[PDB]
């Protein structure tokens, strides 16, 4: 059997958010690249899975990719995992699948936990089209910038934020999209204290400011009901 | 406890791609709302799941979501699944979902299985932002149109095609985007002869006309590299 790169979701703060398939994959891999081997290593014990770590993320990408195609050619079974959820949404996981077409090693993806479309098909927000986008600029001047240039997309949008992020983020979304524009914001998703807050963009930038923000929110916002 | 509706999705060809929570879910609420009770049957005897089901579809909605509403408001655990993968990102479920918003019953998603995005993850295509639309449209000239309103999107597009119309919806998306339109096709996603071919639009419509075409297909396809 050829070398084969396996791309295996872990779970999004639940660990029975985990597949059969990912246990009995991660077992038999020879190898796992992970974003966060100590992370990581907590998920393998409390599933007795004994392979093998090693550590890959965006500081790593340029020399760990030629060691990784290396093994792969070689007839290694390798998985990768991020921290939570999809792998290979993010650059350093992007980048190895791409190493992997070109030197034409297999890439099997399992399917797993992903916080966007898991909160999305709860959000009363029409789920069928969307567009996933993730985190909005880092920088103040960015983002308002990204926002303006969304305002017109007819369906719904996920984001990701950041707790310290998340009231100026709102301001910024209703600024760019309107006040009255529909949203929702999942909070804690499969833990303990899950939550959705449903309301308007100008609703929720204010409840930011007057609560204990903790913990990574998806951002849902609603298209525009009337494009261009 | 309050009546809760849980998401649950299901494997989308592969019984080891249902997760640990998916298992004690289906086996701890009082009812199993499904669309095909047959084939979820199915799926149920394989896990040892003996939790009663009621059929749930879109010849059903008018009549079944007042009869979950209730048992809910009752305080009954419900799930609801689809016949593959993630639930309520079609019309039934996502209808079923804002009746329990509107009665302030709360909707637990849990994560699992989407075809669109376990492809992306491995196709080679920039994964982040993207824009997921699922079917295009049935009647031939309703999807001529609904590709050229797409022809500038910049990101990394996904469709669903079933097999006897995946050639001449290839042949549409290079005559809307252009035949040099980068693009990946994912045959058999998690079963034995998943396979991902990767190609220009053209190439891909090219090969469509001369294979035994089989199964669902996911259709991923990159963004306009030179919008507007």
Known sequence: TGGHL?????????????????????????????????NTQKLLNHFEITTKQISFHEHN??????????????????????????????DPGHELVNACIDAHIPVVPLPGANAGLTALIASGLAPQPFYFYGFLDRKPKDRK???????????????????????KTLQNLAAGFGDERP????????????????????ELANWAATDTVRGEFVVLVGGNPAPT
Chains 1, 2 share one sequence.
């Open 6 to 38: 396996y791309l295996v979701p872990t779970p999004i703060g639940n660990l029975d958010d985990m597949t059969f398939r990912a246990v009995k994959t991660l077992t038999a891999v020879d190898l796992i690249a992970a974003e966060d081997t100590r």
């Open 61 to 90: 990408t340029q020399e760990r990719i030629p060691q990784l195609i290396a093994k792969l050619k070689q007839g290694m079974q390798i998985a990768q995992v991020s921290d939570a959820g999809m792998p290979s949404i993010s």
């Open 145 to 167: 910038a990204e926002i303006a240039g969304l305002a017109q997309r007819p369906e719904t949008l996920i984001f990701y934020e950041a707790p310290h992020r998340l009231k």
């Open 183 to 202: 949203a929702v914001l999942c909070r804690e998703l499969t833990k303990r204290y899950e939550e959705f807050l449903r309301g308007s963009l100008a």
